[PDB]
DNA sequence: GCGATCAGCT
């Protein structure tokens, strides 16, 4: 996993805030997922913050909003500079101890992973580097990003720091964002139009990224999505108008430690079994990554798992095909995996990455 | 009381 430092610009720390990252001249957070926030509220970092008043955290506006909602991260309130998407911004890295100054230009590119998720393009004195954070990009997407180009061709990129979550030909293809939404939309419509007592439970992990499913179900079916908390989105109207804490809805994305046991007993996580004394009829839909081999005999994105239970294709991360297309196109001198998954090794990931780089 | 680690479990 990515220890926070790119070889070319070692005095900035991205998505890791512990150990050698405690000396960073500047911090960046690609997105508000716990995996990418290790050390970010360590007591030793809060202290260092009060000593070095020049050290800041840079992220997207959305990421800043989502981070400053959690009470454990309020000590950052005044030490976070949001940068707008697709907006080259010069940052003055200064060393406290030595007086050394360095200038670096950063561009945030949308990563398609969760609200506020960015890639960081860095341009300075030691080449051009791309840190992808976590990303999901359809085939061709890199070729349509203007700020990855100069004079209509791709920039000379020394190094790519790449989300390799599915970097194996096993995960050749994953159904697209649109096919995944469409499959869920139709299952949900087919159920909740049967009677006002037919309800769906969207069984989603407790992390940002399912918002676009809730948004699109809500738009297309005129029904707000029940959640536990929506206060993180209070200054974000384009998600918030699709959610509600009012349990009187046919679409639930509420959560509870015993939600499975609740489901066995025809109870929604927020605790209701009934409306006007009439029992609800619940189906559970569980977003779950599905993938297809190169032989393109793809199957339904909806998979029925029992009497009242479904899995639906959904992915936060690029397939193997999308990784290869993205890296192939950028043709950097170097590509470095942000993760080595449990099923593979640095050697096999590098065997995949090396042929897509220069020469 | 809190943090960091992990079994266990979604
Ligand atoms: Zn993530
Ligand atoms: Zn992750
Ligand atoms: Zn609910």
Numbering used by the authors: 3 to 361
Text lifted from the article:
A striking aspect of the reported structures is that both crystal forms were obtained in the presence of DNA and were reported to require DNA for their growth; the crystals showed a fluorescence signal supporting the presence of DNA (the oligonucleotides used contained a cyanine dye fluorophore), yet neither of the models presented contain DNA. We re-examined these structures looking closely at the residual electron density. The model contains an 8-nucleotide 5′-single-stranded extension with a short 2-base pair region of duplex DNA that reaches into the Artemis active site, making close contacts with the metal ion centre in a manner consistent with the proposed catalytic mechanism. The sequence of the longest strand corresponds to the 10-nucleotide cy-5 labelled strand (cy5-GCGATCAGCT) with residual density at the 5′-end that may be attributed to the cyanine fluorophore which we did not include in our model. The complementary strand used in crystallization was 13-nucleotides long and was intended to produce a 5′-overhang, but only two bases and three phosphates could be located in the density. The abrupt manner in which the electron density apparently disappears from either end of this strand suggests that this is the product of a cleavage reaction, although it is possible that remaining nucleotides are not located due to disorder. The analysis of electron density at this site is complicated by the proximity to a crystallographic 2-fold symmetry axis, which brings a symmetry copy of the DNA molecule into a position where atoms partially overlap and the extended 5′ strands form a pseudo duplex. The occupancy of the entire DNA molecule is thus limited to 0.5, and the lower occupancy is reflected in the electron density map which requires a lower contour level than would usually be applied. After carefully building and refining the afore-described DNA bound model, significant positive electron density was revealed for the second metal ion (M2 site) which we included in the model with the same occupancy (0.5) as the DNA. Thus, our model suggests Artemis preferentially binds DNA with a 5′-overhang binding at the junction between double- and single-stranded regions; the expected product of this reaction would be a blunt ended DNA with a 5′-phosphate.
